[PDB]
Design a binder for this molecule. Structure first.
Ligand SMILES: O=C(O)C(=O)Nc1sc2c(c1C(=O)O)CCNC2
Ligand SMILES: [Cl-]
Ligand SMILES: [Cl-]
Ligand SMILES: [Cl-]
Ligand SMILES: [Cl-]
Ligand SMILES: [Cl-]
Length: 298
């Protein structure tokens, strides 16, 4: 077994996930979020306790108001970047696709549903029907649904994003995990990893593209779980060495760039499970990828 496997066993045996997770919350970075808290931005924030730090926030390329609730998570050692953002609001869907355009993202990873626990957690920011495209008048963008591939618990959509100012056109891939409860965990590591590897296999995480945009409702809980597992697997892959990966330290590093990443102790516990199981693929057993596909029942 791996060293994270031994740690996992010991934390489970002693029932100390809550205290481990709370220790991460206590040590996490605290940086100012002054732009986020300006009164003119109050209606650009979904949650009053979830704000991007000033130092890592994504700036829109407009001179009236450059603010969006989004953070650049720049993982220097892993050499991968992600943009984590809240589920867009009815007045920030233009800003969201403006951000995708300006940052040259190829993929958007959505980990939530529009309605959860009886509430609207995210605006309907993409078109559901080919023939009903969306136009974002404030940012002058056009968005068309090109096709969609619906599986049991996730959906992949091809979108066309057009800068109406230049008539330039880009293909955006939308990866929508549709079975991960808010404040909850995926149904299995298998189905989480099946989805993550689908994002990976698309090419959307390539350094040739802008950072992938990852969001849930707040852009911290599920988004943080997704990013932590991906980065840990990537660090392991780069060194081909499971023992070089200290998952809690990686999470603390990520939290330098956005607050609150991973919102429950069980999501941290699940992060371990995903990385431990994903390690089998990283370390040369590609048959596990087939097993996940079956176990996930797509
Ligand atoms: O969507 C996620 O995974 C996520 O982190 N959601 C979060 S984080 C967070 C909230 C929510 C929410 O959805 O209500 C409510 C206010 N406090 C912090
Ligand atoms: Cl103001
Ligand atoms: Cl939905
Ligand atoms: Cl509901
Ligand atoms: Cl909304
Ligand atoms: Cl937190």
């Amino acid at each position: 077994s791996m060293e994270m496997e031994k740690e996992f066993e010991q934390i489970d045996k002693s029932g100390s996930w809550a205290a481990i997770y709370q220790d991460i919350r206590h040590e996490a970075s605290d940086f100012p979020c002054r732009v986020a808290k300006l009164p003119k931005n109050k209606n650009r924030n979904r949650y009053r306790d979830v704000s991007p730090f000033d130092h890592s926030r994504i700036k829109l390329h407009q001179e009236d108001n450059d603010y969006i609730n989004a953070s650049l998570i720049k993982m220097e050692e892993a050499q991968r970047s992600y943009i984590l953002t809240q589920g867009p609001l009815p007045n920030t869907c233009g800003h969201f696709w403006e951000m995708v355009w300006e940052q040259k993202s190829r993929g958007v990873v959505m980990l939530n549903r529009v309605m959860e626990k009886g509430s609207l957690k995210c605006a309907q920011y993409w078109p559901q029907k080919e023939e009903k495209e969306m136009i974002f008048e404030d940012t002058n963008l056009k968005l068309t649904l090109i096709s969609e591939d619906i599986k049991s618990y996730y959906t992949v959509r091809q979108l066309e994003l057009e800068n109406l100012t230049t008539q330039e056109t880009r293909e955006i891939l939308h990866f929508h995990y549709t079975t991960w409860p808010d404040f909850g965990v995926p149904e299995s590591p298998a189905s989480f990893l099946n989805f993550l590897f689908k994002v990976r296999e698309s090419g959307s995480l390539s350094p040739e593209h802008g950072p992938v945009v990852v969001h849930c409702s707040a852009g911290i809980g599920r988004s943080g779980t997704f990013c932590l597992a991906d980065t840990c697997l990537l660090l392991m892959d780069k060194r081909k060495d499971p023992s070089s990966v200290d998952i809690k330290k990686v999470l603390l590093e990520m939290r330098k760039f956005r607050m609150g990443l991973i919102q429950t102790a069980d999501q941290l516990r699940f992060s371990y499970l995903a990385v431990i199981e994903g390690a089998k693929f990283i370390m040369g057993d590609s048959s596990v990828q087939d097993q996940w596909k079956e176990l996930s029942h797509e």
